[PDB]
Amino acid sequence: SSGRENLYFHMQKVVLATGNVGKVRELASLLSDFGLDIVAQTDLGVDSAEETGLTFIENAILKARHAAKVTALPAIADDSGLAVDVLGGAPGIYSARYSGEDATDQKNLQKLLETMKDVPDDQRQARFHCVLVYLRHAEDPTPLVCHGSWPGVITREPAGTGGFGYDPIFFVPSEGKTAAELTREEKSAISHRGQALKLLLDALRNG
């Protein structure tokens, strides 16, 4: 249903609001078919935006807007995190810096375990979220939004050393293991980010 401006009708250069080489390579490859030439905001000299939002969507939009503004290019951005039902969605937008200053993945996951230590086994539901947005320009009032999510259950102990962040405490019942126990291909096939990318393909292809 999205309107014109997201695909070339030659190629349109689009900035991705990150400096992550792998994510750029990941999207560049996926959108090159649609004539989109994906480039990292860092390649273009953009510095990171202050992430002021109180939702994943607000953060994604702010990041896209800043990249678009500094480059005069259409922009794609995302924001992601872990939301635990019993904690009202926390860590939420504080996922990466949950344990305050000097946060690391391990201290963050340990803090979540501590916070959840008395939550009964059947009330430990959580979802990873990835919200991807695509803005035509800094002032576009109607960006495309693609929200992927992935449900699971928080463990009481870490298992696995793959992935990053809370993956060692995010159990996936359908797989009978945690996100850190999955291989990259396995995680990539079912994760919140995988789902958000799939959505991004569908919206552009369809209406």
Curated annotation (Swiss-Prot):
It comes from Escherichia coli (strain K12). Binds 1 divalent metal cation per subunit. Maximum activity is obtained with Mg(2+). Activity with Mn(2+) or Ni(2+) makes up 60-75% of the maximum rate. One of its GO terms (biological process) is nucleoside triphosphate catabolic process. Keywords: Hydrolase, Magnesium, Manganese, Metal-binding, Nickel, Nucleotide metabolism, Nucleotide-binding. Changing E51A: Complete loss of enzymatic activity. Optimum pH is 10-10.5. Optimum pH is 9.0. Reaction rates under neutral conditions are <40% of the maximum. This is dITP/XTP pyrophosphatase. Homodimer. It catalyses: XTP + H2O = XMP + diphosphate + H(+); dITP + H2O = dIMP + diphosphate + H(+); ITP + H2O = IMP + diphosphate + H(+). The gene is rdgB. GO terms for cellular component: cytoplasm; cytosol.
